[PDB]
Amino acid sequence: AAVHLTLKKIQAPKFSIEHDFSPSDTILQIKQHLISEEKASHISEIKLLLKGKVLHDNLFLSDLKVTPANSTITVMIKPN
Amino acid sequence: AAVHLTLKKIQAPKFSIEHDFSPSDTILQIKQHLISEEKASHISEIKLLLKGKVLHDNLFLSDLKVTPANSTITVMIKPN
Numbered sequence: 001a002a003v004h005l006t007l008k009k010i011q012a013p014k015f016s017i018e019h020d021f022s023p024s025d026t027i028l029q030i031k032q033h034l035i036s037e038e039k040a041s042h043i044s045e046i047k048l049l050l051k052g053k054v055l056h057d058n059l060f061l062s063d064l065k066v067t068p069a070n071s072t073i074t075v076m077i078k079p080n
Numbered sequence: 081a082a083v084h085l086t087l088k089k090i091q092a093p094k095f096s097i098e099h100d101f102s103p104s105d106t107i108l109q110i111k112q113h114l115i116s117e118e119k120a121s122h123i124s125e126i127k128l129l130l131k132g133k134v135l136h137d138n139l140f141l142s143d144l145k146v147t148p149a150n151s152t153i154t155v156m157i158k159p160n
Binding site: 006 | 086088090106129130131132133141145147149150152153154155156
């Protein structure tokens with residue numbers, strides 16, 4: 001019942017942080033966690049991807065295709 | 081003896097193309113393929129990542145941690 005993810009920002013300022021999420025959580029919750037950790041100011045600025053696919057806010061973490069080999073989410077942040 | 085990869089550019093102009101590489105090929109060869117496919121003009125402009133880690137030119141494709149779940153390379157292109 002845990003979805004453990006690494007959240008890695010790939011453009012400066014970079015970061016790599018980890019957290020255990022609930023399967024029932026949404027991608028919005030990952031964004032909110034990034035705001036909580038002072039890695040972003042606004043949800044609208046944050047784009048998350050896995051394997052180069054954009055992960056939209058309403059997607060559930062239980063729908064992420066994560067495996068031991070890759071449970072890393074790529075983080076991009078751009079102004080509105 | 082084949083390393084099959086998807087190469088996905090995530091900022092506009094986006095693309096997603098596939099190719100079978102040799103294990104002995106380098107990351108430089110992936111970049112050269114992108115130039116060959118008219119997706120970039122210069123090697124120095126191309127950044128490749130997997131799971132949010134930058135893949136430097138001298139890395140061999142046999143050192144990539146690819147699996148059925150993810151054999152997608154994230155492509156970024158930025159001027160010099």
